[PDB]
Design a protein around this ligand. Structure first.
Ligand code: WJX
Ligand code: VX8
Ligand code: ATP
Ligand code: ATP
Ligand code: CLR
Ligand code: D12
Ligand code: MG
Ligand code: MG
Length: 1162
């Protein structure tokens, strides 16, 4: 990774962009490597840009009553922005005066024009210098504006992320992940290219004033008749832009709603497969796409008329201004052609450059104001303190999540070094109590007083990407402390069974880990940090009795006996070793005191075209009409082979020049062709999205584990939007230009078969340079597109762990990691944008030398009479002016076609592919492994389950209990044989095999949607049945506390619910499914013994029949099981009674609670 060559480039090298030569030569022959990409220039580093704009934005907040973000942007970039505007203007003025020189050179071919001939050579010298100046003025200026826009985007994106880490929890409900991704993705490439267009909001009016005075010289008052037509088009295009904005704004809300639902289902893909919810989720997303695709089409129709105004105005603007003059006095062909030359530039300013500039300001200012509102949102108030009385005291705190208070009149005092136990039922407010202490939930009444040093362990374990060792420690590294906590947390046994010991690369959310392993890593992280108060929100949920006992008596009670700590626990054996006990019920303190006190009381193009047959028929329809237009032109043109229009034998060559200047209107695609073309291009994107989503839900789990969350969102957000908005119009413009060039050459070749010969050297030169450039351009665009994924990945993980980020104070670390993602994307994007400027500058320089060669040859060969070489050659160069536009348009199409190839790559992902009456199942030689060629988790497992009995699956955390349950459903690589009721799993199809099971996953899955939709996504059960199940599982009181009884929309994964309420939701689904074989993966993870009775009574009433495989850790749930399966050292051991199982194991029964002990051994 070498230093940027721009740093030491010479002045001439900067001007011509010659410093890009090394990578253009390397990428042509062989593929680019990681070492070929240079570092970013220091000026556009994210760190420097963020500090610059932040320093100026703070001045507005302290100097003006109405702080504006645009004023801070002006103070940073205005003078460079306006500096490039004057050179862009001068290049366009050089363009406006070209017909003054070129028109006289063309007139010198007529022997009658003796005045033009006398100075023809001097006009050639001036014309050549005109071309050179224009080339050197435009391209450096346009690239300078591109660089300013890139720096503006980077600076604004850093401020957005820094604000995100400060947002208050009360506004987090209203800010979804889809909203933030939409804001970033929409401006990722659009914003940077916009600054090249912004200056035309004032350049174009000045061009119109200049050109109208030159047209006035020819046609005195008749000129204004053509201007009035352009004013009508200007008002028409202004109305089109306002309609397009209206449709786009209405569509924005549905796009954000789609992205959040798409992210949720792919994160929980394993639960989706186990439930067999692929069909329901596809139909759910399909209805969201349908509503937003209607607004896409209406916007696309309006944008057709906006982009067709240029081509259709070519004839009428000239005709309206030539006709009144010709009727009063005769007009010569020379004067007609000169009017056309000026009007070509005039039409470009009015109908192409100005409205695009106006729309750019609407887009940029719309995004700036949207970001400005985000930067002023409510901020998290950190009430940190330097010191205290070394104790924490709470005084009659009442809190609301907003009419029922979550907490009321809570008070307690905890002296230094004491342990407080928090008890209660499900939904009693035990988690909310800890949120208020942290300052994450502001109370409406009461006060809290303690020191600022707090350590926090969440009930929902969050794992940041990186190393296991990197998760436990912060940026500091104390080896003696690291070994201490790892031993006390019982992590040594699990670490020794890993390929990298403790240097394993964990994914986002720790997919590769077990449920209880994530709990231990979350607990070890909290105890490693030095603090005054320790908040532990039930870390013993997913742990067995033996591991729980060891950790409690060796880490909580031993390593931190002299530090204040609060423990949420439902075990009576933990209460006996706590200094004080608090019992919550409905948010009220049911009891406060001591224990004793309580005791007493290339191929992408072809595949894109042929995916929909309707597109092929529309293209043929366009082709047939085009042939008739060319044929009609031939007839009328060949037919031409005091009068209103004066023609002479020596002036007849102007006829072909006039045709070329108006060919863009005769060959324009009318609404009979433009509208159906754009309409059918949108149906292609509709089909591709359905195929892409379908294949993702069908891929094997091994493939999906390698995909990162931000790489999934990158394709479904950015690429899909490109196929909807940009590609249909970019293809239309390319097709229009190609037909114009093809038709113009075809018409003049048959009548004059030397123009076709003269244009071959120019055509081949353009094609050869295009082929050379595209070898490197396609690789850089691929690297830049893949550089957007790390930005989205970092955004997702920061929102999921926001509370843990603030608690441990690691905000500066995450801000630095976000700058790495920005700098990584900038390196590829800047390099891609630089080589593109080289190509577009060279394509114009190639045009210049051919025009210079033509100019001098034409003038010198023109003898005393006539001169035919100049007539032919100057016509050929007029045609090649349009091909230059077509070639540049072809590069834009190929840039967008990279998004098509990335979509097809996901579609090509491989697919993973009265019977249930008894429930008997036999297993033979089952071997389970997560990856092919990986280590096995289970080996040669064999057992049999008789029909109708219940089985207890036991074992230590991380032994492979969840692996065994996943092996039944073929969620991993299996090598055994399983026969349910006599049929082998190989014979019957996978889709039928999984439908025989009713599953309760260990990881609960709740998506953004109605209560009714979560319980029943296929809508196959009535409301009465749903309420009937809600009675059995105890969910009526939970539902009725919400405004909508089965109509309330759950958001953010159901954050409104408590942890134990999500368990009852998963129990409700299993009872409603009514499957013969049931696989329950610890259905009572955090329930207190009171709520566990709901599981116990459902186990014998709803599941009175059927074969039930329990996977519980609590000993009380083993009284109902006939058989027992014990996993240890990758092997299953079968028992027939619980007493014989515990007879052989001493340490296991030493950890059993005395209450359960007497129930097992009377
Ligand atoms: C080497 C190298 N390899 N690569 C990848 C980049 C580089 S380069 O940037 O160093 N040079 C070139 O790349 C380069 C520089 C100038 C030119 N010019 C074409 C006309 C022209 O006249 C200029 C003109 C008289 C109009 C005036 F001057 F008056 F304006 N000049 N062509 C260049 N090319 C080299 C090949 C890659 C293809 C080709 C022919 C287009
Ligand atoms: C009076 C004025 C002068 C210069 C600017 N712009 C700039 O200096 C820069 C810029 C910013 C956004 C852009 C843009 C260029 O080009 C775009 F891509 F189109 O978007 C170089 C930063 N802006 C204004 C202005 C407009 C509108 C409102 C206000 C206001 O104070 O309310 C101020
Ligand atoms: N996707 C995966 N890829 C690789 N290894 C995995 C994966 N999922 C789990 N493992 C590993 O396989 C082993 C067993 O997994 P685990 O779910 O299966 O056991 P468990 O008995 O269910 O644990 P717990 O009681 O904590 O839920 C562990 O070492 C775990 O780290
Ligand atoms: N973000 C929230 N917005 C609104 N209500 C909430 C929110 N979080 C929790 N609640 C509600 O507040 C009550 C208590 O929440 P909960 O976390 O706090 O208690 P808990 O004792 O920790 O329960 P559990 O044992 O299930 O973890 C419940 O009625 C729950 O539905
Ligand atoms: C960029 C702008 C502000 C430059 C100046 C614009 C105006 C003042 C210029 C642009 C073109 C100019 C005209 C060009 C040609 C002629 C014909 C000549 O026989 C009389 C002057 C006259 C009619 C000029 C008058 C001034 C004019 C209309
Ligand atoms: C150089 C381009 C400046 C563009 C200024 C846009 C108009 C701003 C008007 C003031 C806000 C209402
Ligand atoms: Mg809780
Ligand atoms: Mg498990």
């Amino acid at each position: 990774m070498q230093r940027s060559p721009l740093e030491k480039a010479s002045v001439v090298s900067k001007l011509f962009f010659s410093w890009t030569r090394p990578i253009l030569r390397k990428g042509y022959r062989q593929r680019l490597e990681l070492s070929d990409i240079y570092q970013i220039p220091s000026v556009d580093s994210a760190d420097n840009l963020s500090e610059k704009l932040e320093r100026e934005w703070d001045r507005e907040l302290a100097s003006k009553k109405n702080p504006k973000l645009i004023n801070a942007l002006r103070r940073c970039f205005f003078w460079r922005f306006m500096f490039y505007g004057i050179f862009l203007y001068l290049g366009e003025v050089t363009k406006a005066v070209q017909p003054l020189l070129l028109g006289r050179i063309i007139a010198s071919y007529d022997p009658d024009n003796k005045e033009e001939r006398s100075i023809a050579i001097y006009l050639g010298i001036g014309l050549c210098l005109l071309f050179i100046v224009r080339t050197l003025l435009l391209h450096p200026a346009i690239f300078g504006l591109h660089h300013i826009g890139m720096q503006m985007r980077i600076a604004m994106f850093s401020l957005i992320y820094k604000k995100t880490l400060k947002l208050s929890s009360r506004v987090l409900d209203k800010i979804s992940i889809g909203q933030l991704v939409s804001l970033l993705s929409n401006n990722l490439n659009k914003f940077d290219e916009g600054l090249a267009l912004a200056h035309f909001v004032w350049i174009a009016p000045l061009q119109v004033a200049l050109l109208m005075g030159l047209i006035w010289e020819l046609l005195q008052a008749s000129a204004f008749c053509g201007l009035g037509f352009l004013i009508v088009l200007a008002l028409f295009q202004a109305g089109l832009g306002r309609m397009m904005m209206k449709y786009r704004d209405q569509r924005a809300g549905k796009i954000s709603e789609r992205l959040v639902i798409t992210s949720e289902m792919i994160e929980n893909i394993q639960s989706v497969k186990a439930y067999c919810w692929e069909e329901a989720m596809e139909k759910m997303i399909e209805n969201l796409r349908q509503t937003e695709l209607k607004l896409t089409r209406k916007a696309a129709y309006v944008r057709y008329f906006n982009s067709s105004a240029f081509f259709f105005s070519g004839f009428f603007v000239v005709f309206l201004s030539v006709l009144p003059y010709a009727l009063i006095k005769g007009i010569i062909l020379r004067k007609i052609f000169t009017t056309i030359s000026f009007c070509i530039v005039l039409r470009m300013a009015v109908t192409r450059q100005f409205p695009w500039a106006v729309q750019t300001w609407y887009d940029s200012l719309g995004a700036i104001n949207k970001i400005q509102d985000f930067l002023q949102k409510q901020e998290y108030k950190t009430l940190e303190y330097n010191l205290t009385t070394t104790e924490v005291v709470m005084e009659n705190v009442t809190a609301f999540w907003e009419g029922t208070p979550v907490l009321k009149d809570i008070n307690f005092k905890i002296e230094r070094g004491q342990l407080l136990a928090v008890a209660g039922s499900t939904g009693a407010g035990k988690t909310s109590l800890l949120m208020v202490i942290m300052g994450e939930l502001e109370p409406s009444e009461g006060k809290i007083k303690h020191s600022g040093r707090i350590s926090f362990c969440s009930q929902f374990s969050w794992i940041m990407p990186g190393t296991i060792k990197e998760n436990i420690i912060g940026v500091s590294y104390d080896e003696y402390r690291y070994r201490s906590v790892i031993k006390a947390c019982q992590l040594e046994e699990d670490i020794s069974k890993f390929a990298e010991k403790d240097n394993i690369v964990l994914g986002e959310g720790g997919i590769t880990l077990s449920g209880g392993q994530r709990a231990r890593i979350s607990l070890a992280r909290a105890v490693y940090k030095d603090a005054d108060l320790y908040l532990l929100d039930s870390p013993f949920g997913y742990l067995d009795v033996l591991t729980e006992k060891e950790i409690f008596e060796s880490c909580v009670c031993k390593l931190m006996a002299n530090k204040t700590r609060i423990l949420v626990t439902s075990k009576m054996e933990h209460l006996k070793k706590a200094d004080k006990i608090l019992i919550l019920h409905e948010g009220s303190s049911y009891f406060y005191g001591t224990f004793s006190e309580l005791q007493n009381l290339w191929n992408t193009y072809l595949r894109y075209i042929t995916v929909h047959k309707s597109l092929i028929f529309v293209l043929i329809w366009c082709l047939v009409i085009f042939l008739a237009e060319v044929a009609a032109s031939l007839v009328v043109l060949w037919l031409l082979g005091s009068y209103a229009v004066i023609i002479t034998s020596t002036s007849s060559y102007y006829v072909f020049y006039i045709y070329v200047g108006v060919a863009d209107t005769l060959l324009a695609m009318g609404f009979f062709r433009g509208l159906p073309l754009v309409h059918t291009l949108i149906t292609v994107s509709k089909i591709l999205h359905h195929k892409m989503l379908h294949s993702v839900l069908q891929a094997p789990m091994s493939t999906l584990n390698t995909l990162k969350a931000g790489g999934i969102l990158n394709r479904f957000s950015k690429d899909i939007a490109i196929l909807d908005d940009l590609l249909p119009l970019t293809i239309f413009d390319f097709i229009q230009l190609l037909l114009i060039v093809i038709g113009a050459i075809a018409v003049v070749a048959v009548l004059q078969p030397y123009i076709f010969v003269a244009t071959v050297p120019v055509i081949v030169a353009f094609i050869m340079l295009r082929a050379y450039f595209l070898q490197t351009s396609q690789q850089l665009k691929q690297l830049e597109s893949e550089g957007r994924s790390p930005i989205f990945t970092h955004l997702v993980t920061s929102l999921k762990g926001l509370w843990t980020l603030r608690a441990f104070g690691r905000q500066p670390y995450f801000e630095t990691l976000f700058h790495k993602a920005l700098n990584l994307h900038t390196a590829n994007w800047f390099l891609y944008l630089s080589t593109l400027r080289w190509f577009q500058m060279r394509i114009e320089m190639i045009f210049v030398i051919f025009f210079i060669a033509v100019t001098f040859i034409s003038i010198l060969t023109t003898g005393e009479g006539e001169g035919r070489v100049g007539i032919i050659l100057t016509l050929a160069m007029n045609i090649m002016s349009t091909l230059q536009w077509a070639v540049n348009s072809s590069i834009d199409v190929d840039s967008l076609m990279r998004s098509v190839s990335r979509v097809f790559k996901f579609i090509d992902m491989p697919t993973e592919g009265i019977w249930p009456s008894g429930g008997q199942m036999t297993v033979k030689d089952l071997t389970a492994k997560y990856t092919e060629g990986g280590n096995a988790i289970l080996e040669n497992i064999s057992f049999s389950i008789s029909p109708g009995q219940r089985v207890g699956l036991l074992g230590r955390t991380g032994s492979g209990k969840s692996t065994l349950l996943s092996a039944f459903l073929r969620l991993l690589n299996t090598e055994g044989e399983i026969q349910i009721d006599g049929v082998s799993w190989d014979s019957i199809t996978l889709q039928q095999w999984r439908k025989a099971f009713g599953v309760i996953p260990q990881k609960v899955f709740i998506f953004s949607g109605t209560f009714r939709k979560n319980l029943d996504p296929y809508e196959q059960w009535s409301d009465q049945e749903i309420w009937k199940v809600a009675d059995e599982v105890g969910l009526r009181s939970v539902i009725e506390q919400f405004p909508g009884k089965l109509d309330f929309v759950l958001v953010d994964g159901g954050c409104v619910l408590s942890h134990g309420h999500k368990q009852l939701m998963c129990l409700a689904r299993s009872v409603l499914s009514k499957a013969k074989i049931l696989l329950l993966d610890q259905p009572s993870a955090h329930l207190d013994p009171v709520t566990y009775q709901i599981i116990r009574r459902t186990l014998k009433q709803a599941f009175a029949d059927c074969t039930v495989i329990l996977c519980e850790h609590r000993i009380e749930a083993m009284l109902e099981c006939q058989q027992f399966l014990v996993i240890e050292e990758n092997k299953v051991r079968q028992y027939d009674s619980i007493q014989k199982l515990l007879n052989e194991r001493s340490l296991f029964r030493q950890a059993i609670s005395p209450s359960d002990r007497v129930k097992l051994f009377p």
